[PDB]
């Protein structure tokens, strides 16, 4: 039953922003979407010091994850703080102001009735006076929301590693842990700590080799991302965080295509050594949810592949025997604790991370009306330059009449193959079906994931629902298509707003 | 409330019923029957590519591939076919019992699992009997019920 | 005076030479599988005469799985199933001497225990994972039994 | 702590035979091998009564099995004429030494010496030893249910005409003791004397059948001890399954049981009563085998030796009996003794247990010649042609007999030993002859050397003997008995030191 100091802080409601004046002991746990600057003093958020001068920060803390503490305890000790006062300031500690994000990502109740209250707009008679409804508001009364705070050893290891980033020498990091061990929270804390305003604004190099529970990466990618701006909440991989490339493994776990996974990881590590050698970018790695078995073998191969200079394990076990002690750290799991209803399952939240991918107009604009009403973005198929070939990543053996139906109403990754690399080698024909064996050898650049809708057979044209994308203008770079293992959420095939709209026998669903 | 099925309009389960279990089991040519079996296995693979399939349908696809292998054996090193049929039976029975014989599973399958997993490898004839028994079981418990 | 299916112990050396000619590079890819077939035939002959030690029969099964997984180029489910069953039988027979500490004691690596569980209770392991596990176990038999003899 | 009545100054010690005069309240348990004649009175043993008039009967009871009680409990009409200086008590049993040449298993085997009669108050040293003081040796004691259920079959055997009986149980259930009791009960000389028809369908732990036989045996005389399949009752044929259990070849086992039931129906439909043993399988495919058997035989009775069961209830009348049951010390290790003593018998009740090597071995030619026309491997038929010839060597193969027209068939490769395919083997009819232990094989001379226990020269006209390698294993004691590890320098022909 976590709670914060009730206010009662001479706060003014405003229209799109709320002004808070926090006392010395005052703290905030805020549920919802909000952007805040600091009008006076230096607010300390999750173990780093943010003064008034720092640029506004954008929060996407979800009910699934824990809420980062927003402390005002730290008295302003530096002149870097730039305080602008238009009200009252009054000499009462620090005053911070937070503005409505209006991300429109809260409007998920339209598709799913269980994903309500994940992003809150009060979804029941009012029990408090002067209540107002915004996209954000802190929980004044105690409630069952876990806050982001760990044992002093957890923050101590990260802080001790942090001043090692303060000086010239660069840091490469490994993080090892099982699913629900807390690797995501550890990485978000570490990236928040390395990009504090006190440290130089030098972008960290973040490598995420986890397809199942990815961070800073859309569903089913291996991704390297130079992070120049920290993501202050649990953005469900729903913020830009400019990245060099998002590598489509196509599978939830490493085991499905171990050779492609290893080749992709080694290529991404080589691309990181193209820039990590420059020593400005402190390379940082996430590892899959596998803690034992072939996952441990992959972790060891990575450790000998990337000169570690640091390794973190989240659970104590046979890792010390398996991994040579070469410096490694030991930190207990301290995994996030929340109810299954409040903290949706990883397989149940992958569906959100997949849906919001196609439903994003921009980085922070989210329109969650069913995709069907939008134009299908018709594309060609065959030897045509629009989209050339199909590659099934795992189930390679498929009837030449059956793959075309297979990709109908399923999530496929649109790749990019330049010049004659696509010409390296079936029947075109209804659909060429570039084989996976020739696919692995060819180098591919990953364009955004595609949702397929209503394959047309009489014409090669096939509809394709893809998120925000620039015009795919290529001189000869054919954008081939692949099918992985990535699942398709029901809500974008059949939600209430289109089932009630039609109510007839829909193609791919049963009642 | 809605559920997702890989097959369009849910009439291709009727198609798999006739393609796995054709109308006539003896007047039909065995070569054409095995072509029908292979087509059904290809469709089950396609539905697996689309999404998860019910364990009964995946087990039917595996069991009919094992049946085609066993009945088309030409002799020689039977190490491969015995191992594959043993694994098919083990996956089928374990997937059934993973979620007493309350499910009406015969004791033959459970004995076969112990023989193959821990004991000596089951013989070719025993595998032929067990795969046919499993093919009958899935039919009686799932495939006869589904109609149009 | 225990009984041996082989007339002399020297045929165990010949059987190892067929499995592990030790001139692995460079020999013809179809000559290696010609030696492997003769060795699998000798293993099954020994098994028909008398019980063979689990490692020798397991080496025969794993080498059959290796030949099929290397010859494979279509419908991969049966090739998946054969190698899967070979690994499960090998691991179970190794462990059937009487659970995490047991694997360390028998020195069987963790990937085998995960492979057996994934094959028995989960979806079929990837053919690329089947190749990995078969090669790991064929290295295991070299590391434990065949090197000494 | 089972004990027998001890008599002083009453029993007489004689040369080659001992006579006991048992009082009315006296019982005897005798370990060893002995021919049992009755001089005066009636001796009721193992629940059935034997009088003085009956011909002498020979006992082979080892330490592994329970000893059948020999009770003195008395009066019946004559018939039985009693026939010595003193009348003494009511009953006077006469035990005759049985020179069965057992106890010679100790020469080849160290632990098996204690099973049979061996010495290792004043007591002379004979092949029968009465356990006067109480010892750990068990005695045949069965529940009153065990007795009256098995006796209710005897009364229905007394009147016309025949009964078909099944026995179902696990490996340790005790079907062997039950089935021996039943044959002892019906063959007693107080009811109809016509020979019972006994069908033994268990290859792993068979009785009245050599190792790896399915055998229909018309039992005309009683085997009064737990004979280890050593003594033979006149049986129309063995059928060599070749495997310890029906799991290995269910189709061969099924086609063989079905073909044996044909002769059982031909000779039982002829007043003789049929009787069946079933494998130790009660779980899994064994229940299905038993159900298929019950449907075909349509038995008049069925007996199950445990509780569990619903499947068997349909449709033949079923009896439920508790398992009870019992040293060996292992039942599978007794299979090796039953295999070895088969090859070491000159004739029933005579076993010379010196290793078979020293005796002149037997020649055959593995070619088109009439010696042995073909060879077939059960189980793994994919044995290489060059490897089958060495595969058969130093194992106990089973030689068959086939008609010349059937003998023609397709053998596969003329070179070395011609393998006959198993597929062609199953189709054609075969008549089992004897189990063969092949000493060695001469590649150059094409003549291979084998040992078989006893044979009638296999005289026939173009009757191709076909060799068969099953699963049955060779007892180590034949290749590497301590006698032939010292008489020939310790080498590795097939044996290795630990």
Author numbering:
A (entry chain A): 60 to 147, 153 to 187, 198 to 399, 401 to 500, 503 to 588
B (entry chain C): 4 to 102, 116 to 164
C (entry chain D): 5 to 77, 79 to 103, 112 to 162
D (entry chain B): 60 to 132, 134 to 143, 151 to 187, 203 to 351, 353 to 391, 394 to 411, 417 to 500, 502 to 589
From the reporting publication:
A HEPN (higher eukaryote and prokaryote nucleotide binding) nuclease Las1 and a polynucleotide kinase Grc3 assemble into a tetramerase responsible for rRNA maturation. Las1 and Grc3 are highly conserved proteins and have recently been identified as core enzymes involved in processing and removing ITS2 spacer, which is a key step in the synthesis of 60S ribosomal subunit. Recent studies have demonstrated that Las1 is an endoribonuclease that contains a HEPN (higher eukaryote and prokaryote nucleotide binding) domain responsible for rRNA processing. Grc3 is a polynucleotide kinase responsible not only for Las1 nuclease activation, but also for nonspecific phosphorylation of the 5′-OH of the 26S pre-rRNA produced by Las1 cleavage, providing a signal for further processing by Rat1-Rai1 exonuclease.
Cleavage assay indicates that ScGrc3 can activate ScLas1 nuclease well for ITS2 cleavage, while CjGrc3 exhibits relatively weak activation ability for CjLas1 nuclease. To better understand the differences in the mechanisms of Grc3 activation of Las1 between different species, we also solved the cryo-EM and crystal structures of full-length CjLas1-Grc3 complex at 3.39 Å and 3.39 Å resolution, respectively. To be noted, the crystal structures were solved by molecular replacement method with the cryo-EM maps of Las1-Grc3 complexes. Structural superposition shows that the conformations of all Grc3 domains and Las1 HEPN domains are almost identical in the two complexes, while the conformations of Las1 CC domains are significantly different. Notably, compared with CjGrc3-bound CjLas1, ScGrc3-bound ScLas1 has a more compact catalytic pocket, which may explain why ScLas1 shows better ITS2 cleavage activity than CjLas1 in the presence of Grc3. In addition, His130 in the ScLas1-Grc3 complex active site and the analogous His130 in the CjLas1-Grc3 complex active site adopt two different conformations, which are similar to the conformations of His142 of CtGrc3-bound CtLas1 in two different active states. This observation may also provide a structural rationale for the activation of ScLas1 and CtLas1 by Grc3, as well as for the fairly weak activation of CjLas1 by CjGrc3.
